[PDB]
Ligand binder design. Structure first.
Ligand SMILES: O=[N+]([O-])c1ccc(O)cc1[N+](=O)[O-]
Ligand SMILES: O=[N+]([O-])c1ccc(O)cc1[N+](=O)[O-]
Lengths: 117, 115
């Protein structure tokens, strides 16, 4: 996939997050993808584990905003906000992508000190 | 190493960059570290190659400023500016058990350069 494709995929990830659609999120990930959210916690491996992880977003209506996004090589680094309610999280994320454009890995860098309001 | 010590290493690195100290930069990296700057370009592998990469900073004076830094596990993600021009960069470093930098990746393009 191209960097443009991967940027597009990030935008659809953020769409499905904002809509509370874990099935649509999980479908963006590769069968053997990894999710580390937050970085430092035990990695979730494979689509089944990833779908379970995202299950709590079911039927949650949130908003997202991309502050900056850099799609380079097979990777996308993006700095973005997630607003639920409420509370606004300030997140640095990195995703990497397989040859078929599905997400191979995601890492999210934030703590409660990046949550406001 | 602890996240607090890795955060410290990032601060040391950014000052060695600001001051133009490539040998001191190289010393912060592990002997088999990797540098990918920018992401998408050929990786620089091993401290000797990394020292050569940074060689253009020798005695070059710049300014660096951290916007936000998150030290988590054995990683640090940081959003920062390098300054004429100013570059806003997203960087990720990972660290070995002994606190040396195992890997660095820098995410920026000329679109992130403003007057
Ligand atoms: O912690 N979080 O809420 C979070 C952080 C980064 C993400 O890519 C997604 C989520 N989420 O599950 O909504
Ligand atoms: O733009 N650059 O060359 C750059 C980007 C990220 C860095 O951590 C350091 C440098 N530098 O040594 O100047």
């Amino acid at each position: 996939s191209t960097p443009q494709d991967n940027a597009n995929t990030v935008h659809r990830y953020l769409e499905f997050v904002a809509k509370g659609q874990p099935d649509e999120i999980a479908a963006l990930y590769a069968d053997d993808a990894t999710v580390e959210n937050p970085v430092g916690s035990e990695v979730h491996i494979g689509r089944q584990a990833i779908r379970g992880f995202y299950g709590n977003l079911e039927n949650v209506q949130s908003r997202t905003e991309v502050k900056t996004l850099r799609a380079l090589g097979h990777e996308v680094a993006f700095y973005w906000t997630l607003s639920i309610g409420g509370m606004t999280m300030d997140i640095i994320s990195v995703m990497t992508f397989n040859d078929d454009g599905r997400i191979k890995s995601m890492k999210a860098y934030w703590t409660p000190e990046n949550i406001t309001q």
